[PDB]
């Protein structure tokens, strides 16, 4: 009781009762989920401070399930008016800062009551606060168009501008020699969508391999880039894992999975007459780290190498003068201060081991943490809304792709599925089902690529002009030739400006 005098003096009485209200909500959430067991029912439960499980991930998962996974299964539909929703998510970010401060105070209260569990690791929650602050600032940037004289960049983001400019099969104004082939433009778009959607740097983009991308056993939509560091990047104690994810967008021209599958198709095959790819690999004697972890996800001068840096710097310069973007140093070379969290060994092994935490009524890996991934980083860095959190936002699929077009592209994976799927190593069949998911995404988002960019080098082969191809093309574009507005969404703020076809076609310089 030595430190209780300067603990009450750290706060007002009003702020102390607000904080006790907020961690009373937290302990109610922990008792209804049985993280801490209740002593008895139909009695006043008096849990101690000595044994209260508090950590960064528990506080953040409370923040998920109460504050930012706004389900409300009878009253979700009161988010229509923009000013009311602006006041409401200003209230959300205010209560976010207040609950983070209250649970930080609860940690400071429990550490003096002999509880060795409550270490907050506050840079994690500061990254979460800065993430939600940046999302509220993006909503502020759209709702206030009188900020500066850069209103064209207020309407169109650099991401959509550079992405939509890099779907163009002709480069009469982009680059004469630098962006000749469509495969080089698709690997530049893969580099741009692994740099912008995933805040890494140049050498960590060089670390991307074939077998590093795992698969979602729960949701299947996320590209599970488990950045495994074997005790050497700056530090020992081998658990330093940064988990990354890529989800299918609403706009097909910003989806990274179809782009990745298109470039891996143009690397496995290429063009049968002009630009031949690298050829299909062995995938039969693949030891875990022998053939998949040596061939990069994008090629260069040699067949099995990573290219030169100033070539990509000049590519960035030519694209950003084509897209009218003043280039800086913080956004595309160095690491930002708004990134994915890296997990230390104890909290990465302990918190997700379900059999050691079997007393819980609902494990976090099942619903809120999709395969060891934070939810809000996932659905903010994909530019989505994390508020519905259990809806069918990603399950939008009218006119589903047939089964005859599955076997016509990538037949080797069908050959391996009719081969022994189990007898190979784990990364081999993991890469096989990975390319199956990527092929499904490519067959999904292919008719928009054919409709809005028909000059692309995929269709420089007379086997693709069959009846089923154009039949699925017409069956997907049957709801796009008679409507003045687009049927597919773009960005959660930008669905009331670029929903019309005129504003979307006006971003394209060559052949709108």
């Amino acid at each position: 009781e030595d430190r209780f005098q300067e603990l009450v003096d750290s706060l007002k009485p009003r702020t102390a009762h607000q904080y006790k209200t907020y961690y009373t909500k937290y302990i109610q959430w922990c008792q209804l989920n049985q993280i801490i067991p209740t002593p008895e029912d139909n009695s006043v439960n008096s849990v101690p401070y000595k044994d209260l499980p508090i950590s960064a991930e528990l506080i953040h998962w409370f923040l998920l399930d109460t504050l930012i996974t706004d389900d409300k299964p009878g009253e979700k539909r009161e988010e229509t008016e923009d000013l009311d929703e602006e006041e409401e998510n200003s209230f959300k970010i205010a209560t976010l800062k207040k609950i983070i401060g209250s649970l930080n105070f609860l940690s400071k209260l429990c550490k003096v009551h002999e509880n060795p569990n409550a270490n907050i690791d506050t840079k994690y929650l500061e990254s979460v606060t800065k993430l939600h602050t940046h999302w509220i600032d993006s909503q502020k940037a759209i709702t206030t168009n009188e900020t500066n004289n850069t209103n064209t960049q207020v309407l169109c983001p650099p991401l959509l501008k550079v992405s939509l400019n890099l779907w163009n099969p002709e480069t009469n104004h982009l680059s004469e020699k630098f962006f000749k082939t469509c495969s080089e433009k698709l690997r530049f778009l893969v580099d741009f969508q692994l740099r912008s959607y995933l805040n890494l740097s140049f050498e960590e983009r060089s670390k991307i391999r074939f077998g590093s991308l795992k698969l979602g056993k729960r949701d299947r939509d996320a590209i599970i880039y488990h950045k495994v560091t074997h005790s050497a990047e700056k530090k020992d104690t081998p658990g330093h894992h940064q988990l990354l994810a890529l989800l299918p967008q609403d706009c097909p021209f910003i989806c990274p999975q179809t782009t990745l599958a298109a470039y891996l198709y143009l690397r496995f095959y290429g063009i049968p007459s002009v630009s031949k790819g690298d050829g299909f690999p062995n995938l039969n004697a693949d030891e875990n780290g022998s053939l998949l972890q040596d061939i990069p996800i994008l090629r260069g001068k040699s067949l099995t190498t990573y290219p030169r840096e100033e070539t990509f710097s000049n590519y960035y310069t030519t694209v950003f003068r084509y897209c009218h973007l003043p280039y800086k140093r913080r956004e595309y070379f160095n690491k930002c201060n708004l990134v994915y969290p890296t997990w230390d060994e104890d909290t990465f092994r302990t918190f997700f081991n379900e059999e050691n935490h079997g007393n819980w009524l609902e494990q976090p890996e099942a619903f809120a943490f999709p395969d060891k991934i934070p939810f809000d980083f996932k659905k903010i860095m994909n530019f989505k809304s994390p508020y519905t959190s259990y809806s069918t936002n990603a399950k939008k699929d009218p006119f589903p792709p047939p089964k005859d077009l599955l076997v016509q592209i990538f037949p080797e994976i069908d050959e391996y599925k009719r081969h022994d799927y189990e007898g190979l190593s784990q990364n081999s069949r993991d890469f096989l089902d990975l390319m199956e998911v990527l092929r499904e995404r490519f067959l999904s988002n292919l008719p928009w690529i054919y409709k809005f960019f028909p000059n692309h080098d995929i269709f420089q082969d007379p086997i693709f002009g069959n009846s089923d191809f154009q039949s699925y093309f017409n069956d997907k574009t049957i709801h796009s030739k008679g409507s003045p507005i687009l049927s597919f969404d773009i960005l959660p703020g930008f669905n009331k400006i670029y929903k019309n076809k005129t504003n979307f076609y006006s971003l394209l310089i060559e052949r709108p």
Partner: protein, 423 residues
């Protein structure tokens, strides 16, 4: 069964000494004070009838601004809402406000303007920041003020109501000041507070300051933050700021400046009150570190009270005394200290500090008056000091004889303070 009439028949000194210890807590649905809720190996947690649903649906959204803080254990709220109908009409409560206003704001502190139930009514908050009593100004003038102000016009005027922003939202600050503008009630308020939990002030603070000249009965200004102390009530070297500052005509009006909770007042080189040339008192309420060699202390102020501080430097009077009688500090402490405890030193206890004093026999009555002139040169005409809860004064504490007598200095919570020598 408590009897109100038998209580209200006994005279007014006993009723003062009842309502002085009943701090402001008129209700039985008081929250637990925040000393047992932390000193516990337990967390009181919730776990709802036919009548309480009606109260939490109909009464509660009127009071959802100031009472949503107490959502932990909502038995407190469904005990509160049966007091909330009748407690403001109670005869004990109104008698407490009568003997408050008849003793000039001493008993229970600082009725507050607020805007709830669309009226701009007064409010009383206890120390746990809970409203208990809310009166509109017609009812407050009718049945408590006019029940004690029969015919003398020096007591009809009610000018002790605080204003207290950070209680309420800045839109409600704007609406409260607009309704206070359309009436002639700026002379009603008596003091303002400041919140905001380089020169970037909040909207409510600017709205409060831009109508602060209109009071003409304002004293007792106070702030609550170190990132707001430097912006309007410290001098800071700024000599020309037309907007956003605090309007030099109204710097003359105030009587004291309360400094609620901070870390240091001398974050810059000097924490100077060169302006506020008319304040008499100053109370440092929970500031962590203060340096008495870093305050400039205006031309005629009287009281420097201070409480709950963590470190005091001192006016370093000893370093100027040792230049005068020309000794070393060890020789001074060994030879020229008498530690006299005749009878007035033993009147107020101070059982933890040891009160010391210079020698009447080893100093020759002049260089004794010079040693006292050092102390009165370093104080510059203050009298009341009142050291409450403190810890670890750096320099030794030196207090003059004329001010240590008559109980004008008063160390109250003597735990880590020690060895106050009196010269």
């Amino acid at each position: 069964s408590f009897n109100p009439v038998r209580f209200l028949e006994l005279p007014i000194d006993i009723r003062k000494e009842v309502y002085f210890h009943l701090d402001g807590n008129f209700c039985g649905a008081h929250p637990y004070p925040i000393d047992i809720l932390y000193k516990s190996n337990d967390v009181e947690l919730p776990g709802r009838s036919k009548r309480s649903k009606k109260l939490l649906r109909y009464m509660y959204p009127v009071f959802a601004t100031y009472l949503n803080i107490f959502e932990y254990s909502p038995q407190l709220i469904e005990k509160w809402l049966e007091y909330a109908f009748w407690l403001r009409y109670d005869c004990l409560v109104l008698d407490c406000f009568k003997v408050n206003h008849l003793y000039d704001g001493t008993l229970i502190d600082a009725l507050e303007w607020t805007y709830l139930d669309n009226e701009l009514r007064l409010a009383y908050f206890n120390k746990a920041s809970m409203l208990e009593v809310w009166y509109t100004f017609k009812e407050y003038k009718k049945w408590v003020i006019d029940s004690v102000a029969f015919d003398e016009l020096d007591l009809l005027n009610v000018s002790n109501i605080q204003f207290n922003i950070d209680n309420l939202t800045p839109q409600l600050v704007d609406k409260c000041l607009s309704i206070l503008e359309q009436k002639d009630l700026f002379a009603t308020i008596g003091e303002v507070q400041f919140g905001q939990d380089n020169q970037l002030t909040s909207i409510s603070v600017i709205r409060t300051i831009r109508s602060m000249e209109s009071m003409k009965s304002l004293r007792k200004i106070t702030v609550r933050g170190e990132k707001l102390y430097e912006l309007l009530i410290n001098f800071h070297g700024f000599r020309d700021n037309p907007g956003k500052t605090i309007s030099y005509i109204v710097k003359r009006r105030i009587n004291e400046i309360r400094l609620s909770r901070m870390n240091q007042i001398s974050r810059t080189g000097l924490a100077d009150f060169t302006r506020w040339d008319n304040l008499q008192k100053l109370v440092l309420s929970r500031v962590a570190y203060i340096d008495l060699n870093s305050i400039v202390f205006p031309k005629n102020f009287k009281s420097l009270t201070m409480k709950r501080v963590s470190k005091i430097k001192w006016w370093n009077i000893e370093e100027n005394i040792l230049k005068e009688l020309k000794v070393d500090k060890r020789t001074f402490k060994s030879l020229y200290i008498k530690e006299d405890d005749s009878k007035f030193t033993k009147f107020f206890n101070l059982r933890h500090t040891r009160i010391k004093e210079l020698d009447k026999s080893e100093i020759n009555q002049i260089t004794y008056l010079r040693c006292q002139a050092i102390v009165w040169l370093s104080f510059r005409t203050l009298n009341h000091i009142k050291l409450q809860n403190v810890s670890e004064v750096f320099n030794n504490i030196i207090v003059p004889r004329a001010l240590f007598d008559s109980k004008r200095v008063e160390i109250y919570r003597c735990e880590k303070i020690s060895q106050v020598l009196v010269i």
